[PDB]
Design a protein around this ligand. Structure first.
Ligand SMILES: Nc1ncnc2c1ncn2[C@@H]1O[C@H](COP(=O)(O)OP(=O)(O)O)[C@@H](O)[C@H]1O
Ligand SMILES: Nc1ncnc2c1ncn2[C@@H]1O[C@H](COP(=O)(O)OP(=O)(O)O)[C@@H](O)[C@H]1O
Ligand SMILES: Nc1ncnc2c1ncn2[C@@H]1O[C@H](COP(=O)(O)OP(=O)(O)O)[C@@H](O)[C@H]1O
Ligand SMILES: Nc1ncnc2c1ncn2[C@@H]1O[C@H](COP(=O)(O)OP(=O)(O)O)[C@@H](O)[C@H]1O
Lengths: 291, 282, 281, 290
């Protein structure tokens, strides 16, 4: 197969690993910076050009779209799709995932377990917003399109109101979420490829904090996931319509709760922890479903 | 009916006219600034609140979403949809329309007549981009999400290259389009409601550059407008069309078109016919 | 006199009042939207044009520059200065005031009382930043050029760290400041014209503005703060602390509605009266 | 000496060369990403901290401030100045240079030769703006703070009006400048350190175009500069109040004309062309004036 890898940086672990796994399995791997791609839209002969030459004869494309102000990245993926190239994840599904507001609304409607969650931008009655989410303690995230830029635990409704008012000032979309203290600042990252959770790992916060992220001074370890945690991860990915996804889960008193569904999950964390060829299994999935 | 009108400004002609037409026809009309709406997402009892009180018992919603950095506006419309409220245009369709890149790609694939069109952001070979669009003269638009912020006619490939390089500097998505000189700086704005073009008008430039009046549209211009709206999946849309040597060409499909221009020119109750459409399909 | 009023919004109270006070005192008042002004820079005959016609014979200019992404507004003021027109406040001084980081650094160096203050953008050791400012409780402001867009009181170092990390995400300049609880959510706004505090008022949180007799050291602080920035007309915000008056902000074009409604003083008038005396030949 | 180098990227040619030249001459060279510096402002004991540890005992600082949305970078340089550290270029001077509108106004007032130049943002009468600058052909630049983001040569007043209207739409500060066709798409880049032009080079455009930039398929070569070109470069730098500056000059029919004054000029172009230790002479300047 000839496979395109849509990546802003070819020197990043996850992109390097995808070209390795591909080359290893006898495929021709081309890294494309989507911004440097330009195209002619047309019924008959639609073209994508790159550094003066046309992009032809591609069998599959792996979209690794970053959390940028990038409607253009999805447009380049869409051209590939319309020119017959098989996508790892469809542009339709990626657009659903990257809109965190839309993503949670869709999971909520299909009955996926979520924390109690509120949305706001310029609310006039902030006390009313806090009351709607069963009050403090509340986690308060800001959204800059795709990225959940800042996260604050507010213990009292006074602190919650004070922080929401600050974020309002910055004209940002605000997310207010029930704090799940039982988790102990830990989450399960389940890694979906096709109909299977191929790899899983627990993330843990530092001695003091609640922020579980791997790239914020955080230990990762092996974990045996429950059948309902597996079932939740697969269902979450299927609702978004993704073939490959990372699903973040919280172990709560009332079962597993989905935090995020990522349409292009990082590979360094999961591979170092599990010693699994995740990059390999992604390429292996393309081999079977490319047709 | 109780009808919500999602508008940032209730004092704008198009919003005023929609509440008038509604009140006139015996409906309860509520104007909602989507940003001041806040909600709880939930399977069982999903709520939208507004200035301390809940929003209940709405039968239909008219989304007038502006060309802002507003993923939130679509989210408020989506809650209404999921809470059973009938939308004039579905959030799915509006998202398609507001992404001008995606919009033209979708029209192109379904064989709707378009000008020859190219897209770029950081192209390394600009001469190659110009060659792909059959060269100058070229119209060059910048895109800031939904809005086509700036527009330049470039007569020579030198000017085209010089302008594209400038817009590249501003890190903006660039659209390069075949200039249709036959149009004479005029376009047909067709106004779609359901399966019908209810109103049309010609727009004209000043004596030199590239005034609105009545115009009888061809059967193929009508058919193009309806097909363009159906491809986007819109019930109500404004479709801009160029009269070219090789037939009608679609410029834009607007999911919430302005009412002042079309109503002043045609003297038609367009606001009324939109409310009348909600009455039948609600 | 012929006086230009550089205002981004010509319908606003403060601009209207400045043309009134001027007309009342027999002057010719022209309101200029700085963005709609265009100019040719030149040694001999430097021109400013506006809506097709040249701007000539101006004796003084009142710069009301807004907190925008506006290097252009200062450029229009600079042309006026270079064309011999007397400015109410010099472009040099306005540039000092609008850079809130630079403003506090300059006040600090000349020994003006300030709250204990820290600056950050992408700090690696946030606990270290908090320690440098004598810890919580801390007030945490974000800066978008001129405006202090958002303000959060953080009671504990945990909350301080959590909020700073959030603002870091937004790639904004961050200000960390000692919380002065003694103030009771109140500040003195002193209004400087020349060598005099012509008007003052207390502001209160939930809000209310009211009359206040200012101390001799509060007056002296306001005048010194304005003189350090090099402003002839300025609003100086002050906190009453246990260890004396502390300057919060120095505004190079302070609003007139608040101060005039509260004091019933012709502040617009006294500004025009200042131009009459110091405009000179 | 202990010398701080304020640079976002320590792996860039110009920063590497400045630490080399310093180390070579027996100095302690520390690279500081200004954004990762945080400080306490205070009369008595004003601190700058960096990755948990304080920054102490610095004798001089070399500011390499980029064309970013960075009021913060100047603030970090200002702390160093106020804490007694000698700057290669003063924060005051750098602020003058980076504001291209202010920079040209200041050069114009002190009688430095410039092209005929106009400024606009939201002009109502664009034909009037074009007339004020002696009409087409006109060069039209957009400004995003410090950077001259786009540059367009407009041959006719029709094209000039059409391009200005487009840039107006983007709510950007617009610069309109007399096109100097005699230059042949070539400029002199003079390199100032103290009271001396230590190095110079001609830049040339491709067979067709006018854009003389090195990173646009453009030849650089050695050039003997006139005494008036030297005098112009030094005077331009002195008006901005810079000790180290790159001054771009056009050879015109009516003498040398200054295009730009750069407060932190690149070193790769000038050093490759001249084979001079420019990095060395900058460090040598700090040694004498510190
Ligand atoms: N509502 C919440 N309740 C409990 N923990 C939460 C909550 N929101 C976020 N967290 C914690 O913060 C971590 C990171 O936040 P999240 O927004 O899910 O991810 P990211 O930082 O990658 O955007 C989570 O894995 C979890 O440990
Ligand atoms: N490629 C083109 N060929 C001919 N006319 C064009 C072209 N692009 C734009 N125009 C003219 O400009 C009008 C509006 O410009 P356009 O960028 O399409 O939309 P907007 O009105 O939103 O700026 C069109 O209706 C048409 O009259
Ligand atoms: N560090 C602080 N200590 C005490 N009160 C403060 C502090 N910072 C702000 N305030 C209070 O906040 C209000 C002023 O808000 P702010 O945005 O800082 O000022 P401005 O009106 O100049 O923008 C006043 O009531 C003032 O007392
Ligand atoms: N008005 C003009 N007349 C002649 N040549 C010009 C003019 N403006 C720019 N140029 C040429 O274009 C080159 C590009 O400079 P420019 O892009 O404006 O500077 P920078 O990229 O350093 O901000 C100049 O060095 C000069 O050779």
């Amino acid at each position: 197969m000839k496979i395109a890898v849509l990546s802003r940086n070819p020197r990043l672990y996850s992109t390097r690993r995808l070209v390795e796994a591909g080359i290893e399995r006898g495929h021709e791997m081309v890294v494309i910076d989507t911004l440097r791609a330009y195209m002619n839209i047309a019924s008959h002969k639609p073209q994508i050009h790159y550094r003066g030459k046309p992009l032809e004869g591609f069998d599959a494309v792996i979209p690794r779209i970053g959390a940028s102000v990038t409607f253009y990245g999805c447009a380049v993926l869409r051209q590939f799709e319309m020119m017959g190239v098989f996508p790892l994840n469809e542009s339709v599904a990626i657009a659903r995932s990257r809109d965190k507001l839309r993503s949670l609304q869709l999971l909520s409607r299909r009955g996926i377990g979520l924390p109690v969650t509120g949305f706001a931008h310029s609310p006039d009655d902030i006390p009313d917003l806090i009351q709607m989410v069963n009050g403090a303690p509340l986690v308060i995230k800001v959204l800059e399109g795709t990225q959940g830029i800042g996260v604050v635990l507010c213990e009292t409704a006074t602190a919650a109101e004070s922080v929401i008012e600050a974020f309002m000032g910055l004209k940002q979309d605000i997310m207010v979420q029930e704090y799940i203290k039982e988790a102990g600042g830990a989450d399960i990252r389940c890694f979906v490829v096709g109909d299977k959770v191929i790899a899983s790992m627990k993330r843990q916060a530092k001695p003091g904090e609640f922020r579980s992220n791997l790239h914020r001074g955080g230990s990762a370890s092996l974990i045996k996931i429950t059948p309902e945690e597996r079932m939740t991860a697969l269902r979450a990915a299927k609702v978004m319509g993704l073939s490959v996804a990372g699903v973040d889960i919280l172990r709560s008193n009332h079962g597993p709760l989905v935090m995020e569904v990522n349409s292009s999950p990082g590979l360094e964390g999961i591979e170092v922890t599990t010693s699994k060829d995740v990059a390999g299994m992604i390429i292996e999935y393309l081999e079977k479903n490319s047709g």
